[PDB]
Amino acid sequence: SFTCIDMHTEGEAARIVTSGLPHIPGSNMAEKKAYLQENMDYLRRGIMLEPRGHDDMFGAFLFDPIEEGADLGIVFMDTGGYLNMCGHNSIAAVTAAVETGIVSVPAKATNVPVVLDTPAGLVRGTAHLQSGTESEVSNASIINVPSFLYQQDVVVVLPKPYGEVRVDIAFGGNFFAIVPAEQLGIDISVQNLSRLQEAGELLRTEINRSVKVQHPQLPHINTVDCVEIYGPPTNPEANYKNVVIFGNRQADRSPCGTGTSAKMATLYAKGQLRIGETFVYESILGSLFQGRVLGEERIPGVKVPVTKDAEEGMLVVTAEITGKAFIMGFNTMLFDPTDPFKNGFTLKQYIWSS
Amino acid sequence: MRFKKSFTCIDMHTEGEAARIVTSGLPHIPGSNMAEKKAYLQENMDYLRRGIMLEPRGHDDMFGAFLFDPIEEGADLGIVFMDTGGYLNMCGHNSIAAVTAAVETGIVSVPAKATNVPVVLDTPAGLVRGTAHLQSGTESEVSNASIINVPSFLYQQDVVVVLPKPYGEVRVDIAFGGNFFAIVPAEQLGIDISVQNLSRLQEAGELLRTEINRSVKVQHPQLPHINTVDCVEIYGPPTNPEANYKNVVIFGNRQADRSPCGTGTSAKMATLYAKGQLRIGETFVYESILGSLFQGRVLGEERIPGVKVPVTKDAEEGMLVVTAEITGKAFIMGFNTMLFDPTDPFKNGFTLKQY
Ligand SMILES: *CC(=O)C[C@H](*)C(=O)O
Numbered sequence: 150s151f152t153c154i155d156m157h158t159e160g161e162a163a164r165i166v167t168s169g170l171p172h173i174p175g176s177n178m179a180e181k182k183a184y185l186q187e188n189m190d191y192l193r194r195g196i197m198l199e200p201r202g203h204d205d206m207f208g209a210f211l212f213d214p215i216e217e218g219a220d221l222g223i224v225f226m227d228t229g230g231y232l233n234m235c236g237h238n239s240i241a242a243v244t245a246a247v248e249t250g251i252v253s254v255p256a257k258a259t260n261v262p263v264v265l266d267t268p269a270g271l272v273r274g275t276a277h278l279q280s281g282t283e284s285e286v287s288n289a290s291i292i293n294v295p296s297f298l299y300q301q302d303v304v305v306v307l308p309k310p311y312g313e314v315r316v317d318i319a320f321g322g323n324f325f326a327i328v329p330a331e332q333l334g335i336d337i338s339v340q341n342l343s344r345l346q347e348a349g350e351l352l353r354t355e356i357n358r359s360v361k362v363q364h365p366q367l368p369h370i371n372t373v374d375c376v377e378i379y380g381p382p383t384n385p386e387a388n389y390k391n392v393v394i395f396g397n398r399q400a401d402r403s404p405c406g407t408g409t410s411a412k413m414a415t416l417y418a419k420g421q422l423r424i425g426e427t428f429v430y431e432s433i434l435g436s437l438f439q440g441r442v443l444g445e446e447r448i449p450g451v452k453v454p455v456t457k458d459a460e461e462g463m464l465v466v467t468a469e470i471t472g473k474a475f476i477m478g479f480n481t482m483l484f485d486p487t488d489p490f491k492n493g494f495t496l497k498q499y500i501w502s503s
Numbered sequence: 504m505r506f507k508k509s510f511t512c513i514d515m516h517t518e519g520e521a522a523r524i525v526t527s528g529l530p531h532i533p534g535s536n537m538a539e540k541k542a543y544l545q546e547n548m549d550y551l552r553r554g555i556m557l558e559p560r561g562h563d564d565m566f567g568a569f570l571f572d573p574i575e576e577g578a579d580l581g582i583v584f585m586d587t588g589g590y591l592n593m594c595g596h597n598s599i600a601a602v603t604a605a606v607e608t609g610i611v612s613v614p615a616k617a618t619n620v621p622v623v624l625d626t627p628a629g630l631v632r633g634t635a636h637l638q639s640g641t642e643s644e645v646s647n648a649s650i651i652n653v654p655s656f657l658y659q660q661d662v663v664v665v666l667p668k669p670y671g672e673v674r675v676d677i678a679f680g681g682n683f684f685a686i687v688p689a690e691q692l693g694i695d696i697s698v699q700n701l702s703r704l705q706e707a708g709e710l711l712r713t714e715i716n717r718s719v720k721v722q723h724p725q726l727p728h729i730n731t732v733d734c735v736e737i738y739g740p741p742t743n744p745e746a747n748y749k750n751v752v753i754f755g756n757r758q759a760d761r762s763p764c765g766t767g768t769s770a771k772m773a774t775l776y777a778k779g780q781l782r783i784g785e786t787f788v789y790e791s792i793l794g795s796l797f798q799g800r801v802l803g804e805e806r807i808p809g810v811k812v813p814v815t816k817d818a819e820e821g822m823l824v825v826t827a828e829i830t831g832k833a834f835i836m837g838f839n840t841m842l843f844d845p846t847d848p849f850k851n852g853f854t855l856k857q858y
């Protein structure tokens with residue numbers, strides 16, 4: 150049996166496994182993720198998939214922190230595999246840590262830091278407390294790992310009825326292909342969600358076939374794992390609306406924190422967003438996240454495709470993302486060794502271009 | 504405060520199909536029988552079903568039930584079933600799960616040295632007599648569970664239903680197995696029962712259910728409150744050698760059963776029995792889209808003089824009903840305390856499924 154704190158962040162699940170896991174080696178969180186992925190993938194499958202989960206479930210395993218200064222180690226998972234970072238799950242974990250007492254709250258504290266050691270690096274979170282409560286969280290922010298536009302105006306050819314599209318590749322904790330919905334000929338709407346999933350899958354697969362990406366500081370991150378499809382906002386408070394397609398072409402119900410970070414890095418690189426300016430991203434559900442670019446930095450002697458010959462070094466930015474998570478369940482998940490679906494199942498069919 | 508309005512559940516599944524069995528958290532629900540309590544919930548507290556069944560706490564193919572104290576004489580537990588669209592009068596897989604959960608979690612006592620434990624369910628469709636078959640050696644580990652369903656019957660035969668393209672005109676049987684079913688060969692819809700075709704099967708099932716309920720009036724002759732076709736059973740040749748046929752049942756907000764569906768199996772057996780194709784005691788094995796198997800036997804038959812349904816011939820002496828036993832295996836998959844913060848925008852759930 151495993152104990153879980155089932156959270157959701159504005160409609161998007163985050164199943165946070167807090168106890169009962171087998172002991173896992175690894176000298177950092179990236180190696181722990183690799184160990185799970187390579188040797189114990191049955192854990193993910195049983196916890197994420199039907200019948201205990203479903204095709205759009207998401208979650209994370211907690212571990213002791215390893216990187217200096219962190220409160221919790223975390224490895225994220227979904228219906229397909231393992232993302233190096235997740236903003237909505239980070240917001241959920243920061244929230245759960247404070248509300249359930251995994252991390253202590255100083256006396257008279259109105260903000261409580263919760264630092265996550267993730268496969269993509271250190272993620273500095275803050276739970277913003279409800280005034281007059283000891284540990285009720287109003288919302289939570291996360292300062293993401295450095296983000297960056299990687300490659301601009303990448304042209305890929307998808308099968309009909311999509312054909313040729315142009316995207317940006319950016320890192321926000323995961324590598325994203327960021328594309329306007331208009332180029333796909335699909336409005337972002339609940340009605341089009343299945344098509345959005347198919348386009349996202351086709352675009353992700355085609356991008357990884359034709360562009361080889363590599364995070365220049367983190368060897369293990371060498372694929373594009375997420376497709377961010379954006380368009381005009383519905384809520385007048387939002388700058389844009391988006392849906393991210395990832396995992397086994399599941400869709401984020403949240404605006405997606407890493408995807409927002411990647412979008413903000415891209416806008417910033419193009420001069421379209423100032424440091425400290427509030428950016429508001431809306432989801433397919435109408436949910437909002439707020440983000441701000443906190444700073445920028447050039448890394449001398451390190452280039453990505455977008456980095457100019459004249460430029461000694463790549464531009465990165467540090468972005469903060471804010472959202473609200475709720476506890477939806479305290480769960481003890483059970484696995485009878487004679488249960489034929491102890492490792493879950495899906496009825497979703499795979500798709501691929503011919 | 505945090506646990507205000509929470510619910511405790513035993514999350515079960517029966518060969519892949521969820522049964523979220525709510526064990527505490529409801530206030531008193533007015534009603535002098537289970538059918539009335541079901542109507543109360545549906546009319547006055549439907550947001551509870553939606554919050555428990557739907558994302559983010561559930562999903563588009565979740566299923567479950569509320570437990571109550573039994574009202575009907577001889578029953579161990581009251582139960583009201585729920586899904587992503589509404590409330591079925593009976594559910595085979597959830598009854599199998601409830602019998603199993605009752606024994607394994609000690610809701611019912613296991614008599615000294617027993618190998619089989621009866622668990623009787625008071626449902627909106629009537630009394631359902633369950634038996635938990637214990638694993639030899641163990642005190643209360645359940646190997647599988649059988650349920651003797653409420654009376655089942657073929658109701659109306661060769662009903663022509665006209666659906667939009669690419670389906671057009673189809674021929675179905677209507678039969679009662681605890682719910683009314685329209686039973687239809689997948690062949691007639693132009694599609695195979697396969698995971699590939701699941702979305703289409705859901706669409707076809709929903710179309711068929713809507714059209715049937717407009718164009719055909721059904722009425723259970725002994726239970727006034729049952730007067731709609733709630734489920735569509737789409738069947739085809741088996742994949743597993745052990746199975747007679749395969750099916751998928753579409754119901755709720757066009758969700759699909761991952762189990763072979765016990766009420767659908769009961770309706771199918773009553774149909775086969777009526778056509779002389781199954782004898783009393785003969786094992787019928789039904790396969791699901793997942794490859795799961797349920798076993799059924801017809802245990803008894805009765806003609807009810809003076810009571811007819813559309814298939815009852817003038818040559819005949821009252822409508823035929825059968826008593827069907829269904830057997831499957833359920834597992835505990837979790838113990839959950841579900842939370843509903845009043846400021847949570849999705850306290851009542853959501854679905855992204857089309858229209
Ligand atoms: C982990 C994801 O689902 C991508 C969106 C996010 O919140 O980072």
Ligand SMILES: *CC(=O)C[C@H](*)C(=O)O
Pocket residue numbers: 566591593594595596597734752754760762763764765766767
């Ligand atoms: C309750 C349902 O899902 C219909 C199938 C069955 O097991 O009776």
